[PDB]
């Protein structure tokens, strides 16, 4: 018995979050929807974000405003470009809505909260954008561009848990910890996407970061600087790896299996991607990504109990203490953070 409403909902999550989709509609039915309708208003967020056809006139009122949308009956919107990728889902968002409204008032606030706080973020940027530069030059500026796009996410699934008591409520008092799930997550991608992300002229590394390497990021890419694109990555990924204790920290706290797998899942997914960049030149000339049969092995790991994951962890960390190289301005600070990742799952475990 699903309404269309909900197979909407359900279509429209296959479309956006592709092979995501999976694993969100295995959740418990407590928060099955929940989690579906968070992901689908954020998704509608990211598609008037991103549609550089939308004037800031018209586009930073709805990124704030969004939260207020989510309680009018119908609402939809056709004013994205005709190619937008996921335009039809604002179009037909009042699949959206009825499903927003269905859920359980606990839930409409923690959704609307996040909608609120990160669309207006999103509108803060996007106005930055227009008026100045909005490069990332601080790693500071950088954890606060991750913590909007993706430490909020993690800010809501942990309070959807928390609500549903899949999560000890102590998650709440410590966020860093979500902070750490979304970080550890965005700026893999942020490292493993940085050609193609270039390449639409999108750039988030920090310059206190890659100015060290590069007199201007775009000589990250030419062949001659390989050799100082691989010492920048490498402390590109040195910052990712300090939050992965954190990380285990956080999955230690979920109490229900099918949340544990919907989180695990990414996280070790992340620590591949990571393992995967480090020290490879590929990196700035493509998308690289991790192989099939490695892939289909996390998702086994990832999918049983915390002992499981930490020991692919540990394994991940291994394979990045091992290609570090002491020709690596970076050497012994790699080593140190993959130290201290092995020795603590070697005391849980
Ligand atoms: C748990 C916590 C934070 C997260 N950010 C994206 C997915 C996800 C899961």
């Not at 848990?161 to 750490?180: D, I, M, Q, T, Y």
């Not at 970076?330 to 993959?338: A, D």
Request: proline share 4%; aromatic share 10%; net charge negative.
């Amino acid at each position: 018995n699903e309404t269309e409403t909900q197979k909407a909902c359900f279509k429209f999550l296959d479309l956006t979050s592709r092979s995501f989709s999976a694993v969100i509609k295995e959740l418990h039915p407590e928060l099955l929807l929940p989690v579906c309708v968070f992901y689908l208003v954020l998704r509608g967020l990211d598609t008037i974000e991103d549609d550089t056809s939308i004037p800031l006139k018209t586009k930073e009122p709805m990124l704030r405003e969004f939260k207020d949308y989510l309680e009018q009956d119908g609402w939809t919107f056709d004013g994205n470009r005709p190619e937008e990728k996921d335009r039809e889902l604002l179009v037909q968002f009042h699949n959206v809505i009825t499903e927003f409204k269905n859920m359980k008032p606990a839930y409409r606030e923690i959704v609307k909260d996040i909608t609120d706080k990160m669309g207006n973020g999103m509108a803060d940027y996007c106005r930055k954008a227009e008026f100045e530069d909005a490069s990332v030059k601080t790693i500071e500026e950088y954890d606060l561009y991750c913590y909007y796009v993706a430490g909020l996410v993690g800010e809501g699934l942990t309070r959807l848990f928390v609500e549903a008591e899949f999560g000890n409520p102590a998650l709440l008092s410590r966020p860093r910890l979500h902070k750490s799930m979304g970080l550890f997550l965005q700026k893999t991608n942020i490292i493993r996407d940085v050609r193609e992300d270039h390449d639409d002229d999108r750039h988030f590394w920090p310059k206190e970061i890659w100015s060290k390497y590069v007199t201007e990021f775009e000589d990250l890419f030419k062949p001659e600087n390989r050799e100082t694109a691989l010492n920048c990555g490498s402390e590109m990924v040195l910052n990712a790896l300090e939050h992965a204790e954190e990380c285990l920290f956080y999955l230690a706290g979920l109490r229900e299996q099918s949340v544990f797998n919907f989180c695990a899942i990414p996280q070790a997914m992340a620590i591949a991607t990571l393992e995967l960049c480090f020290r490879n030149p590929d990196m700035f000339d493509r998308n690289i990504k991790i192989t099939k049969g490695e892939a289909c092995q996390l998702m086994m790991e990832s999918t049983q109990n915390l002992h499981v994951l930490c020991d692919t962890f540990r394994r991940y960390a291994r394979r990045i203490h091992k290609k570090n190289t002491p020709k690596d301005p970076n050497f012994l600070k790699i080593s140190i953070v993959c130290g201290k990742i092995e020795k603590f799952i070697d005391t849980i475990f």
